[PDB]
Amino acid sequence: CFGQCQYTAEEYQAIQKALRQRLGPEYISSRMAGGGQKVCYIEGHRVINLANEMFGYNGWAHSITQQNVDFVDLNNGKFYVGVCAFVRVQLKDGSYHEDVGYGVSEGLKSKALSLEKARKEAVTDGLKRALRSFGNALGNCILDKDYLRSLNKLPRQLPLEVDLTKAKRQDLEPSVEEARYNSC
Amino acid sequence: CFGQCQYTAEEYQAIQKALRQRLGPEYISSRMAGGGQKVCYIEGHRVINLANEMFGYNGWAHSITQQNVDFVDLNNGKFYVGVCAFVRVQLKDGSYHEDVGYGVSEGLKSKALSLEKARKEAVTDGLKRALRSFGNALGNCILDKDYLRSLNKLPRQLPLEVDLTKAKRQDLEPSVEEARYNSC
Amino acid sequence: CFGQCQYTAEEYQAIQKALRQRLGPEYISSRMAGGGQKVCYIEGHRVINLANEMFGYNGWAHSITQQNVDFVDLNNGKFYVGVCAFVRVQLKDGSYHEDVGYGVSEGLKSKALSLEKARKEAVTDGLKRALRSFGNALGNCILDKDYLRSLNKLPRQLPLEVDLTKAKRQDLEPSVEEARYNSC
Amino acid sequence: CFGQCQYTAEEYQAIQKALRQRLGPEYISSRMAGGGQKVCYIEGHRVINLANEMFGYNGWAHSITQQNVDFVDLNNGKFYVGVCAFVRVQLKDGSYHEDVGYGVSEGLKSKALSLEKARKEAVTDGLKRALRSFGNALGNCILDKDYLRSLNKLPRQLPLEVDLTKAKRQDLEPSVEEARYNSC
Amino acid sequence: CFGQCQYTAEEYQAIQKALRQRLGPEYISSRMAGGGQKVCYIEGHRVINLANEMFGYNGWAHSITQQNVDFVDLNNGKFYVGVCAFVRVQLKDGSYHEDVGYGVSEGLKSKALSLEKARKEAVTDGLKRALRSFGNALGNCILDKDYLRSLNKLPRQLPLEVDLTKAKRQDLEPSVEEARYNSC
Amino acid sequence: CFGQCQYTAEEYQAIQKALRQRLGPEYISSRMAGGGQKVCYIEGHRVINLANEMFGYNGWAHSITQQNVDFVDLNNGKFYVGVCAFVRVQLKDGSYHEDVGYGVSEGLKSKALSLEKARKEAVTDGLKRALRSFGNALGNCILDKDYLRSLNKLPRQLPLEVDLTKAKRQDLEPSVEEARYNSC
Amino acid sequence: CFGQCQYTAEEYQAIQKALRQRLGPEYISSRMAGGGQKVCYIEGHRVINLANEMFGYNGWAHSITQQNVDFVDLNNGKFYVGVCAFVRVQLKDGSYHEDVGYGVSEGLKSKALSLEKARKEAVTDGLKRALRSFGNALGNCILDKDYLRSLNKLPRQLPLEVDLTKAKRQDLEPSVEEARYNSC
Amino acid sequence: CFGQCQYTAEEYQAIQKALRQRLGPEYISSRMAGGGQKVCYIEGHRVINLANEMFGYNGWAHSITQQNVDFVDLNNGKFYVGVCAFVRVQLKDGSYHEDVGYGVSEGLKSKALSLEKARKEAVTDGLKRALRSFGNALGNCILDKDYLRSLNKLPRQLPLEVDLTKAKRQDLEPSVEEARYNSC
Amino acid sequence: CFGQCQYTAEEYQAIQKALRQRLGPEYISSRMAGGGQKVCYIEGHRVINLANEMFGYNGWAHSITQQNVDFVDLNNGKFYVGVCAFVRVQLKDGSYHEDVGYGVSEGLKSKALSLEKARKEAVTDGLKRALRSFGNALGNCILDKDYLRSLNKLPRQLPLEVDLTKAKRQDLEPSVEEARYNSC
Amino acid sequence: CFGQCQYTAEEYQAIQKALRQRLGPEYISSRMAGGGQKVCYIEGHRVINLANEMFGYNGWAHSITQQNVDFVDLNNGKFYVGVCAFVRVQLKDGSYHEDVGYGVSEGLKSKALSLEKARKEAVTDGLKRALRSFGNALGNCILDKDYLRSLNKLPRQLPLEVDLTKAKRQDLEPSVEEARYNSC
Amino acid sequence: CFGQCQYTAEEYQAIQKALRQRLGPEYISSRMAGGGQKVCYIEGHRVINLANEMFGYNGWAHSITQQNVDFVDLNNGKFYVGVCAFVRVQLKDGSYHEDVGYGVSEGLKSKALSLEKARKEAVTDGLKRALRSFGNALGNCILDKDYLRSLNKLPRQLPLEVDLTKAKRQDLEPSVEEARYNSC
């Protein structure tokens, strides 16, 4: 099942080796923080892809244990919303890590959009912070000032392009159906 | 059962390969935001079909853990409604992903219709966001801005017209019944 | 038993093929919206029959996990009622889908009738929406605009007349009884 | 045991055949709805008898998961009561269907009689609507407008007179007790 | 035990035959309803005896899931009481049926006696309406208008005079005691 | 254990025969109801003795699932108390019957004595009414008007005398002690 | 364990015989009730001893399910306390009986002493009344008027003098210790 | 373990014999009750010692299921406190007895000391009353007025002086340690 | 594990002998009561050591089932705090004893220190009183007035000095780690 | 799986040796406390890496059992927020340690940011303090004054620069996918 | 697992011997209490190290059952905080001990820092007090006044200087990794 599989020696060794490696400059992006300066981070979908290639689509899971709206205030016609989220990630052997993430909206004149942005940022930040605990290869390096300083002294390479000639254009997946029919 | 089946090697390999692929332009649609620019997304029925072809009609499940109506306000005769939803998707081995979706209604003059639109859009958004977590093939690519600007530089293809000559026209399904009678 | 049977290869393959098919013009009905235009839908009993021929009378189940009366307002002597329902459909292997439905009553002058219409429409809409998630053959086509356009380009066929020469006219069922006596 | 028995092939085939048939004009009855025209339905005991012949006295069960009184109002000395009921039906393999029923009382000058009528009608309506979902043989025909039209073009047969010459006239059931004593 | 004993073929056949039969005129009694005309019914103890002889003293059981005092009102010095009861009957294989009964008290000048009558009549009505669902032989026939009309078309027999020449006159029961001693 | 012994054929047959027997005039006693006339009943300890001799001291059990004090009123210096109880009787195979009893106290001038009488009479009435459901031999006869009218047609026999020459005079009991010692 | 040992034939026969025996005049006492006359009863310790000799020190248990203080009132400087109790007795095969006892104090000028007397008398009365249900030998005789009037027709015997020449004088028990050492 | 060890024949016989014996004058002490006369009782530690020598140090347990502070009131500067306690004793086979004790403090000008006295005396009284129900050898004699009269007519013996020559003077226990080491 | 290890004969005999012994003068200490005289007691760490060497470090356990702060009052600038605790001790075979402890503070001008002293003293007193019930060797002697009299008539020994030349001076415990490594 | 493995002798010995080692100056950082002096600590990602390399990515888990916002105050236009967190770490054999952490914000003029900082710092501090309890190698040495004084008398080495020539630059990881495919 | 691993004989003997040893002066530390004198204690990390080396890093666990903020008062611009904690320690065979600890803060002008100090000190005090109960080697001797007097009669040795030439200076642990790879 899930939560009852135990990693083989080979898979455990491979994952433990892979999780020590640091993220290249391809995975890091920057933001200009309000009142602060350049803050580096890893986008959410990139962390999801890293988790999917590390553990497999069936090797990790995550849930929201609780999400609480901290405050919704109205000042000078603008909405200030702050929302909290607790996200828990589990592996296929039963290993788990749970963390908190926070979502903020300080702008918009519409309450619904503010709450939406806050809640979604909350769950995403919680997922990322909870995945950090498994190792460097999942975002535990963006907190190290050494790796951060060594990134900035590296050439600012252009963002890569995506090729769209072998993309998925039909719903049917012959190999998947053949395997599934043979698995029954 | 469900939740205690385990993927064989062939099926796991197949699904892992198939989930890395990116969606073609057939699946992407666009909107004009409320004060923003072109926002790209995937329709809900499209991601439901993609899930049914990836994991099978018996391979995945999803539930609404919680749904809270954040607010229903009345301003200048018009209703503003914001509703939250937590959706959890599960696979047949026990893997799961839970995310949050938000439904908003802005202009309508009827409280019932606004609440309806909110409650429904909430669950749809939650399902889509929870299915994103399995890989690009289920909507994790629509967030990659590189992928997006790679799509926008392709021609705007025509709307496809679907064949309705072999559509289902009777309730009875001889193959399904003949197969079921032999399972008892 | 239920929840712990697993589909054989033949039945799984048959159902997966049967669910991809689209519905013909016979299953679609139309409404004139309150300010909008032609909205296409599938009547509830039709979806129940489709589910009964897809999975069998014993292959699927459904429950109302929650039903909440959102509002009952009175304006100018007339009642406006809005009710929500959460419906969960489950297959005989443990595969489930849960969705929200909404029932509205706007004009009626009796409160009890309004609540009746609201609650019943809520349960039926929830059932239909939860059945959509199993495939096109259960009502996932009525969201595709391509399918709708291709439907509007077909002739407007006649409503068929049902035959009642072999209808049920006695309570006793000899075959069911002789089969059941041998099951003990 | 109930809930853990599984239908044999013969019994499943027989029941699935017997549930597709439509009800004759015998079972249908009419009402003049408040302000509305002829409404067709099936009396509750008829549906109970049909369920007992289809599945057996031990093949089906039903319970009330919830019953709440929506409102009890007083206007011009007359009472208006609305009651809701959730009824869940189950078979001997685990297959269940749960629906909602509503009872209304807008006449009588006595509160007790009004509440009584409302609650009893609620449970009966819930049972009927839950039994609809198994097939046409249990009342899923009443919604088809084609079947309702085709019924009215049949002759009007006067209700048959039931024979009371072999009715039960003593409590002892010799065959039943002989079988029971042999089953110990 | 109880709830885990499945009927053998002979007992099931016998009970299913015995439950279809209609009650004779010796079981039906009549009241003059308030405003309404003659209302026919079956006394409670008669239904209990019918159930004891259909299924055996150990083949059926019944519980009160909930009893709610709807209202107790005081008008012109007299008490008006209405009470609800939910009664659930279960057989020795797990088959169950749950129904609602209502107790009314209108005229009495003492609150305690009114509440007594209500609470007791509620449970009796619930038990009867629950046992109806097993078949005609337990009171599902008193609702058919055909059977009611055919009853009034029969001669009226004076109540039988019961024989007391072999009534129980000492507590000790030799047969039961010797069987019990041998059962240990 | 209890709730897990199944009656052997001999004991079942014996008890089923014994429960059909009506009670003699020795058991019935009479009261004069307030505002009414002669009401016949069976005293509580007699019903306890009948149950002990039918099923054995280890054959039945009973619990009080609920007891609610309906009201305690003070009028003209006197106390009017009404109390309800729910008693559940269970046999050694798992068969159970649950019923409601009601206790009243109208005249007394001390609150404690009134509540005491109410509670105790409530539990006793509930026990009797729950034991009725097992058959005639446990009090299902006192409701039949035929049996009651037939009882008055019998002579008024003298009150019996109780022999006290073999009464228990010391606590030690050799037979049960030797039997118990041989049981370990 | 306790609660799962089943009586052997010898012990069951012995106990069923021994419980039918009525109590001698040794066990009965007398009180002069306030507002009434001579009431007969059995002291609590006598019933505890009777239970210890009937079933053995390990053959019965009793618990207090609920105890409510019905009222504590103060009138002209004196305290009036009424307290309820629910006591449940259980044998070593799972057979149980539950009863309600009531304690009263209509006297004392101290609240603590009143509450103490009420609570203790409530538990004792509940235990006695719950032990009545096992048979005559445990107090089901004091309710029969025949047995009472047959007792008052007996000579009043002198108070017995207890022998204290072999009373327990040292704590250690050689036989019990030597028995326990051989069990381990 | 504890709660699942059934007594052997020898131990059961021995304990049953030992529990019938009455307690000598060594164990009884007297008090001058407030307003009342001489009241006899057994000190708590003596009852604990008796229970330890009867059932062994590992043969009995006791719990405090509830303890409610009934009242804490202040009059003329002095505190009156009444506290209740529900205590449950259990033997090593599963046999249990639960009773009520009450602690009273009607003197001291300090609230904490009065509450302490009340609570501790309450638990002690509950334990003594619960151990009474096992037999005379544990305090069921102090309620028999015959035994009390027989005690008061014995010579008032002197307080025994305890020998302290073999008292425990070092914590280590050679025999217990050797046995425990050999247990592993 | 714990609570599932029965004592062997040797260990049970050893502990039962050891628990009967009384404590010497080396364990008793004295206090001057608040308005009384010499009160004798045993310090907490002493009973902890006695329990450790009686039952072993892995042979007994204790929990605080409930701690309730009874009162915190401020009078004339000083704090009066009274706190209750319920302590439960359990041996390795499942035997347990639960008692109440009380902590008092009628002094200090600081609220935090008062509550601290109260809570800690409460838990310690509860532990000591709970350990009393296992026998004399754990503090069931400080309640016997005969033993207290016999203590004071024995010479007062001056406090012993503690050898501190083999005290623990490094964390490492070679024998413990050798055994722990061999235990894997 | 997790929570149910047991360390082999070799792994247990290795970890017990590794946990006693003290951390070098590489891991320690310093802060200037408000009004205080230099405080030494270990950053969060460092202790996460230490735990990942001690026990493995699958050998430890941590959860947030509770997080409560102690206070959110607004003084002179600035926000002061204090939040608590309870973090529980668990090893793969079932060993666990739970400890409290606290997050503080005393500055910022934005409420959402202050709550964010408080919550995140709280969870991190709790995780660190819970990991301390496993030994010095996880941050139990930063509390020793001797070790801290020995650190400051050691040369201050320049911050190590991180090399990025072998950093992870692609999502796919051939080794782990091959091992996982062989693990099915 | 953990909680079900019984100690072998050798390890039990070793730990029991080692837990009796009193701690040396190298472990004791001193404070100057407010209003009092020299108080002796053991720093928290010392007790954690002693527990790690007695039982192993996997031999003991601890949890916070409850933490309650007793009071947060503000007097003359300074904060007075008192908090409670219940800490439960458990060994690997199921043996547990639970004790209360208290945290005080009567200084600082900042509420956040006060609550922080209080809560952390409370958890640490609870852990120390709960570990005391296992023996002297974990801080029980710190309460014996004889040992405290004997400490001051011993030369005041200077605190040791810690060696940092074998400190951990890289995260990777070869021995642990080899063992873990061979344990899969």
UniProtKB/Swiss-Prot annotation, chains A, B, C, D, E, F, G, H, I, J, K:
Changing R31A: Abolishes ssDNA-binding. Changing Y41A: Moderately defective in both ss and dsDNA-binding. Residues 128-132 bind DNA. The modification Phosphotyrosine is found at Y80. Phosphorylated upon DNA damage by ABL1, and probably by ATM or ATR. Changing R129A: Moderately defective in both ss and dsDNA-binding. Changing R132A: Moderately defective in both ss and dsDNA-binding. The modification Phosphoserine is found at S175. Changing K128A: Abolishes ssDNA-binding. It is found in: Nucleus. Belongs to the RAD52 family. Involved in double-stranded break repair. Plays a central role in genetic recombination and DNA repair by promoting the annealing of complementary single-stranded DNA and by stimulation of the RAD51 recombinase. The full-length protein forms heptameric rings. Interacts with ABL1. Interacts with RPA2; the interaction is direct and associates RAD52 with the RPA complex. Interacts with RAD51AP1. This is DNA repair protein RAD52 homolog. The lineage of its organism: Eukaryota, Metazoa, Chordata, Craniata, Vertebrata. The gene is RAD52.
